[PDB]
Design a protein around this ligand. Structure first.
Ligand SMILES: O=[N+]([O-])c1ccc2nn[nH]c2c1
Length: 299
């Protein structure tokens, strides 16, 4: 049974998965995604280094493959990450003046988003912008541009494709008592009051065993920022306990603005922490207890 179809039957938009050309051409990834997931995200093919390895010199080989594959197979598409400190070429991080970095950032956002205008459900515009204590992370954008990089990024994104849901996302937002969770909510409320078009908060959810329960109160906290949507992204869970996965699903079901859940890959061996068996399919591409528990929970 398809957890995407089942979550849609509960009124959500999708159950999604991160993938890319290199996954889709091998193993059983394509077959599983066709059957069981309703949205795909590019693991790497829309990151900054993949799409703009030198200034103004873009490439969309991997991104085009995924977008066209999704269209061929009736899947929704998310894109990202437009602005964050990971997967950032040295030519960007070496910029030390505000206006150059603004222009480079705007050009990057606009070029990526306009290529697939109208076809992308959501873009992760800004990622991992917060420190653990809730202050803003001093990535190159914050240090060189200042706080206005986040307003600028979202306003540029809205102009490039007004149909796309624009997301800020971060990790370690899995407890309502954690300062980072409280800080992103306070800052997003104030940014939206300032007119920044932040449509969504995405929770980049890398759980250790037992942390699913905390999401029950963390996700409603994130939703109190007043964004139209929240989502769970890059989900994986050390040990893949049915309990942890079911708690995460229940949290999204309980939050009316939660549109869906994306897991960070199909099969355990391909995970960045494969040996913690943190995904929903095992090394034989067979559904794991956690998958079956999600099915039963959604039925
Ligand atoms: O949710 N995701 O699995 C996911 C994967 C890659 C991304 N790059 N930007 N945002 C992303 C989300």
């Amino acid at each position: 049974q398809s957890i995407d179809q089942l979550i849609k039957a509960r009124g959500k938009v999708y159950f999604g998965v991160a993938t890319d050309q290199n996954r889709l051409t091998t193993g059983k990834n394509a077959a599983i995604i066709k059957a069981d997931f309703g949205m795909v995200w590019p693991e790497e093919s829309m990151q900054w280094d993949a799409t703009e390895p030198s200034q103004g010199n873009f490439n969309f080989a991997g991104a085009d493959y995924l977008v066209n594959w999704a269209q061929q197979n009736g899947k929704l598409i998310g894109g990202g990450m437009l602005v964050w400190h990971n997967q950032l070429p040295s030519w960007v991080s070496s910029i030390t003046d505000k206006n150059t970095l603004i222009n480079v950032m705007k050009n990057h956002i606009t070029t990526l988003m306009t290529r697939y205008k109208g076809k992308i459900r959501a873009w992760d515009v800004v990622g991992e912008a917060f420190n653990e204590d809730g202050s803003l992370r001093q990535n190159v954008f914050l240090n060189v541009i200042g706080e206005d990089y986040i307003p600028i990024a979202f306003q540029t994104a809205r102009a490039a494709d007004p149909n796309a849901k624009l997301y800020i996302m971060d990790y370690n937002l899995d407890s309502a008592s954690y300062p980072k969770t409280q800080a992103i909510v306070n800052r997003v409320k104030q940014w939206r009051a300032a007119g920044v078009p932040i449509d969504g908060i995405g929770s980049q959810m890398h759980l250790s065993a037992g942390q699913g329960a905390g999401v029950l109160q963390a996700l409603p906290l994130l939703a109190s920022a007043g964004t139209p949507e929240v989502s769970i992204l890059m989900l994986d869970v050390a040990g893949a306990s049915p309990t942890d996965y079911v708690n995460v699903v229940n949290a999204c079901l309980n939050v009316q603005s939660c549109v869906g859940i994306t897991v960070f890959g199909v099969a355990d061996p391909d995970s960045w922490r494969a040996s913690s068996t943190p995904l929903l399919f095992d090394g034989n591409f067979n559904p794991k207890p956690a998958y079956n528990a999600i099915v039963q929970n959604l039925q």
